[PDB]
Homo-oligomer: 331 residues x 3
């Protein structure tokens, strides 16, 4: 077909790869959810994805990786988190100019880390996004004249946690909001749209997403996390990403790997709290760093039993197809 249609297909698959989903319809649903949440944030994310894919094409990256969407799933997060942590409000058009520039750095990093990560057959997990956004938010800061950012500061007083005022409806609603917080969206409806987008592709990914989000919520209750943060979904996006990554895609789905994924979700939630407290000193948020560290430390794990099997990266599509491939190769 026309090259423009193929490029938009690449953009859609890139914006879907965030929850490790390669499906253009899932991309359309995710874009619709972003419009539901905040049109400005969605515009920023779409611009980030588009410029990231242009940078990937310019730098003569692999055509298969671009077609899959491997080079667009960092631009969308870059744009969305540029828009989320902007202190100038909505439709601050000049914010698009950083978004164009920083999204150019997503492919480069994605290649560079790849050269590092090829030696241990490790895939990159949105690390280009974390590095680029940390770079931007540190360079600008809350006291920038042009692109001020929302002020994040370390807690200097003991939080007041009235356990009699906990609301279990909101605590349960933290699950879809935890799913939607992967992109930075806090609207429960866009969380539901995201859950539908994952389910239309593969039910195992949706199940592991829900399990990871609820595990992050529970792990955040364990260390007396303020209730507003949990209700806002801040404690479940690293956990849901880790659960999706370790559950059935990069490990062949098995009950052993399922328990490993739950453990990875717990590790990612605790590391999320830790990185939030540490990075608040610089004024930066822990944007998907915890998921990266936990998933990478759980993919490098070497275990003797044959149930825990790590797939080669060349043959990773989605948990059902992964299990089918493992069963075919074994027989």
């Amino acid at each position: 077909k026309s090259p423009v249609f193929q490029f938009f297909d690449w953009v859609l698959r890139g914006t879907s790869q965030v929850m490790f989903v390669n499906n253009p319809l899932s991309g359309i649903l995710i874009i619709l959810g972003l419009f539901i949440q905040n049109p400005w944030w969605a515009i920023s994310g779409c611009l980030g994805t588009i410029m990231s894919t242009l940078t990937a094409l310019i730098l003569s990256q692999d055509k298969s990786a671009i077609a899959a969407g491997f080079h667009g799933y960092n631009g969308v997060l870059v744009g969305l988190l540029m828009a989320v942590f902007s202190d100038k409000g909505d439709y601050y058009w000049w914010l698009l100019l950083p978004v164009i520039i920083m999204s150019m750095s997503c492919p480069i990093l994605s290649s560079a880390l790849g050269t590092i990560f090829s030696k241990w057959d490790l895939p990159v997990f949105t690390l280009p996004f974390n590095i680029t956004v940390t770079l931007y938010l540190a360079a600008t800061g809350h006291y920038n004249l042009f692109f001020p950012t929302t002020l994040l500061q370390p807690a200097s007083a003991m939080p007041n946690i009235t356990w009699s005022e906990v609301q279990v409806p909101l605590l349960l609603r933290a699950i879809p909001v935890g799913i939607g917080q992967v992109y930075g969206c806090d609207n429960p409806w866009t969380g539901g749209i995201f859950l539908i987008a994952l389910f239309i592709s593969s039910p195992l990914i949706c199940l592991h997403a829900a399990i990871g989000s609820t595990m992050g919520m529970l792990a955040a209750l364990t260390i007396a996390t303020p209730f507003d943060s949990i209700y806002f979904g801040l404690c479940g996006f690293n956990s849901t990403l880790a659960c999706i990554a370790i559950g059935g895609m990069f490990y062949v789905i098995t009950w052993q790997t399922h328990l490993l994924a739950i453990a990875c979700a717990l590790f990612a939630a605790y590391l999320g709290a830790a990185l939030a407290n540490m990075l608040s000193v610089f004024g930066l948020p822990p944007c998907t760093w915890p998921f990266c560290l936990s998933a990478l430390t759980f993919l490098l794990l070497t275990t003797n039993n044959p149930a825990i099997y790590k797939l080669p990266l060349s043959k990773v599509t989605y948990p059902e197809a992964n299990r089918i491939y493992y069963l075919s190769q074994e027989r």
Copy 2:
């Protein structure tokens, strides 16, 4: 014999591996020293070791490594440093619940880092402990409602150092206290018990431990470190660990390697001061990070002369046996 006795043997060897010693009697002496220092801290450390070894067995790790104690020497430090930096006092029983959870992460990290470190034949040096404890102490912080930690803050004023008030008896006693501070214990008697525990296995390890501790003390006097910190042994545990690691075990013991070990002790003490000042910003202590960085940067050193020889990890037991093996292989 009965599996329980073998498991307790594994726990003892694990709690001895901290100073790179593989001897159950040394483990018994170290546990006795911990009881001498603080029974609560010792209970926490023993629980950490036990749950770390259970996690290692569950994750089907190598049986030889578990039997040596390679998977228990991070749990003991994790438990001990959970107990040391607890603001709730002694016998705060709920602190055991983090200790169980965090000690599960010691084997995983120990495997993961191993997969990273196998490419350069580097052994892991309590990095799982540092990562896990940094995670915990950052997640909780001093203002946590459930598990508050002791407050560490950067120095904001010039220390007052009356050099006429220096006490050379305490300055000398900083050596055994420096040895005992590896576990977090400040009692001089438990430092002496630790020195006995190292000596009963191999005198070279004890000699290098004393040299490293005194080198850390001297290096801390060089940059006007407050006298209370030196008397408390805080400046000599990274140095003693680095001296033990580089002295005669991972390098064949020779006067060249001895001077290299002294240099590594100096580097580790200065890096310890640096990491203390940096990490105090987040409120975290430099728990054995300096020893890790210094020993890793000194094992990667490539030198043309044949005197400085680095042993393959498969054949590292203790300095006397290491030198015997080197002399046998050379001839």
Copy 3:
């Protein structure tokens, strides 16, 4: 000739390797520029270079690398930045004692990182300097009794930027000052001497240095950097180093690689602002870390087109000779 003359030749080539130049006359010009700027800083830098080369010889490093100057280009920066960030003024003779000690750590790190970086054929880019100086400045701090450092603190208020008061003469003069700031020198005359020193060896290196400095200046205007910082040259030394590294030496010089070098300069300037803001929290400056990170992430970049070619490290001299070698090997 006499060994002393060869040793001084090694020192000169080492002090020239900072801008990736291997020429003793360039070393003489750089030393002259340092005397023009500040005799105390130059004395500190020369002592650092000398002791670094002695440490390299003692540790039996490669004779070819020492003769090239590969082990002296970290000592000079170490000494110069010890002297620049000293709060005791000029000719504080005791500062030489750290300078001797810390410069011993430049070869060790240079070897250690090499063992890490040999797997991906990456050269080390003054990382030993960054690690050592960060170690020193964190260990001492602004409140040290013996070697206090200049106080660096994060910005806590919005800067006042009167754009009508911008001075384009000083803005243009930020280019030679940006070149001279690689060593920490702020004098425009020593910047001109440095430009002459680069040009006498290879015009491409000088051109890329000027382009990188002006690119860093422009990138610093983009995020509303205070005018005093830009006039002082603080925003152009990481950028000029990155432009020199990526322009024509480690990549065969081509218009594609030229655009890549400009992009690397932009990335390095933005990362320089980010690292300045982050490291100001600890009180440390971003001493050449941004150039390191940007150049390393741009050398690991893998690109399919044949124009972007990365040379093996064994055959990298300077851009003209590099292009000659590439053209000879291709034919």
